[PDB]
Structure 1
Amino acid sequence: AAQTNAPWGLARISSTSPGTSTYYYDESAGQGSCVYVIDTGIEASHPEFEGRAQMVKTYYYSSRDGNGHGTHCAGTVGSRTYGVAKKTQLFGVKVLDDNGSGQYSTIIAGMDFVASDKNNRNCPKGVVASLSLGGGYSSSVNSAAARLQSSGVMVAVAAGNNNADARNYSPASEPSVCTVGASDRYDRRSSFSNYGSVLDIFGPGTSILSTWIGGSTRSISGTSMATPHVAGLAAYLMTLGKTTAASACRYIADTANKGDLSNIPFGTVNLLAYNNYQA
């Protein structure tokens, strides 16, 4: 399949070179998989989701996304126009309030919710979790992510937007999960992107166009934008049967575009997510 005039991030993950605008992908499109978006919520009524998105859990007075961040990430995972896996199912878990903030205990409970709730869902191709959030180091937030990965859920987390070593940030510093950095359309490391040895992969993160609340769209930047690219790719590769939840991050690193990114600090891998699709 080919989507003309796709967002630059979608065209990048299916390209060996930057500067293209057509997203190529197998038409399975993540059908049969499920991706949890652990964020501020999802505006499920957005027509871009085509009824494939729904809120399954909230820790606040409403499950509605009154922020736009969680809707934007879910749009990058599997919206029809701005999504990597255009046929996956999206389950919203609102652990962040409408200001984008949330206590670590609530975030920890949300990860343990996904660990159990996936047994209540129909995901024969596998389950993915997309964590576009982060804060200071916390061994309990890290261990909640390891428990989530250990249960058979591909956990993709943001490296962080501190332009520092992600070792001092959770759940970014949890080694068992997939820590994702951000790059821009000229294959440069995003000026805000965290780095370090804990990073597993890079994804498009600067000026990413996706859904927004109010049935609208907008373009924002952040490692929180690169994480849904990897998560959607994992649900895409898992539906194709190319990998599993325990080995998706390793498989994505193995098939990534190598050495194409600039301003990658010494010790940080120079890998860019790549779906390896041949039309």
Structure 2
Amino acid sequence: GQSVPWGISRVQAPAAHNRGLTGSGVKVAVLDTGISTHPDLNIRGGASFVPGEPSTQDGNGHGTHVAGTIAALNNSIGVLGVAPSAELYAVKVLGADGRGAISSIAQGLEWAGNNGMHVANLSLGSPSPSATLEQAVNSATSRGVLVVAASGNSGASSISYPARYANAMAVGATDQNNNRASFSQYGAGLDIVAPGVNVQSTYPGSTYASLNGTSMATPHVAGAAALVKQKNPSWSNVQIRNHLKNTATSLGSTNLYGSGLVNAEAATR
């Protein structure tokens, strides 16, 4: 039997799938700990930039769970992602320990732009800026990639990098009451928010697990971006980003929430 996680229903992704918008023909790169083979996922390819781990398989769990919020398959098992027909690419930039070097994330972003990805999901972040990282964000953006990044989980009133950079779309986390989750970083540069508490998705060992974090909010927006691109295939990364903000539901403070809650129904109208 298949279960629809509350967050998927909260961003109104079934209303888009009822219009025939599933993410088909949109390439989405998940720059994370890898993606493990799973019955409710279809991985099309990828690359690893982690020296001790030449495989794209996930030794952690985090990248698999991210991948499932974006694109868990629409069938009779497991769960359902926002864009269940997106072409999923596993770009391992972080190791089995969740740790990763900035050089690894920056070549992940160069691979994305070199391989014609439409959206790159970075559910990772640092409180410090990096020249290397910002240059990689900018080069993937000028190669048409929409870079979507987590605001961070420290609860502080300023957001992490790369989300703070102008060319990355910054995503915060909400709870089931549409309040800011207490860990969700906010402040200048935050663009939008999405569900990030008690998020059920695909996990290694052909199972399902619940996690909390702005890392779980980010894939809801990466997926909504794939829905808008299949609907509007000529739109650029900036057009898609502004539309998602223009159609988001206001939740209060632009300081806390940016444009508000992503809404895949209103975005594919």
Give the TM-score normalised by the residue count of structure 2. Answer: 0.88
Counting matched residue pairs gives 257
* Runs of 5+ unmatched residues, structure 1: 16-22, 119-125
1:196 is matched with: 187
2:221 is matched with: 230
Secondary structure of the structure 1 residue equivalent to 2:94: coil
Q: CA deviation digits over 1:220-252, x for unaligned, max 9? A: 010000110000110111001174322211110
Distance 1:134 1:164, change over 3 A: same
Distance 1:198 1:220, change over 3 A: same
Q: Does 1:46 align with 2:44?
A: no
2:28 is matched with: 35
2:122 is matched with: 131
Q: Of 137, 157, 160, which residue of structure 2 is paired with 1:165?
A: 157
* Runs of 5+ unmatched residues, structure 2: 74-78
1:71-86 aligned within 5 A: 71-80=64-73, 81-86=79-84
Identify which range, 242-251 or 171-180, moves more after superposition: 242-251
The amino acid of 1:47's aligned partner reads P
Secondary structure of the structure 1 residue equivalent to 2:4: coil
The amino acid of 2:143's aligned partner reads S
Q: CA deviation digits over 1:81-104, x for unaligned, max 9? A: 331001010001101000100011
1:92 is matched with: 90
Cα distance in 1 for partners of 2:134, 2:171 equals 15
Secondary structure of the structure 2 residue equivalent to 1:54: strand
The structure where strand makes up a greater share of residues is 1
1:276 is matched with: 265
Secondary structure of the structure 2 residue equivalent to 1:156: strand
The amino acid of 1:99's aligned partner reads D
The amino acid of 1:104's aligned partner reads I
Q: CA deviation digits over 1:184-208, x for unaligned, max 9? A: 1110101100001200000111111
The amino acid of 2:258's aligned partner reads V
Residues 146 and 174 in structure 1, CA contact (< 8 A), matched pair in contact too: no
Distance 1:220 1:53, change over 3 A: farther
Identity of aligned residues (%): 36
Cα distance in 2 for partners of 1:252, 1:265 equals 15
Q: Does 1:255 align with 2:247?
A: yes
Secondary structure of the structure 2 residue equivalent to 1:24: helix
Q: CA deviation digits over 1:132-179, x for unaligned, max 9? A: 011122232223212222210111000000111334x21021012210
The amino acid of 2:262's aligned partner reads A
1:173-192 aligned within 5 A: 173-192=164-183
Q: Does 1:151 align with 2:140?
A: no
Residues 55 and 91 in structure 1, CA contact (< 8 A), matched pair in contact too: yes
Secondary structure of the structure 1 residue equivalent to 2:110: helix
Residues 82 and 211 in structure 1, CA contact (< 8 A), matched pair in contact too: no
Cα distance in 2 for partners of 1:249, 1:38 equals 19
Q: Which segments of structure 1 move beyond 6 Å, counting only runs of 4 or more?
A: none
2:63 is matched with: 70
The amino acid of 1:136's aligned partner reads P
The amino acid of 1:78's aligned partner reads A
Residues 109 and 136 in structure 2, CA contact (< 8 A), matched pair in contact too: yes
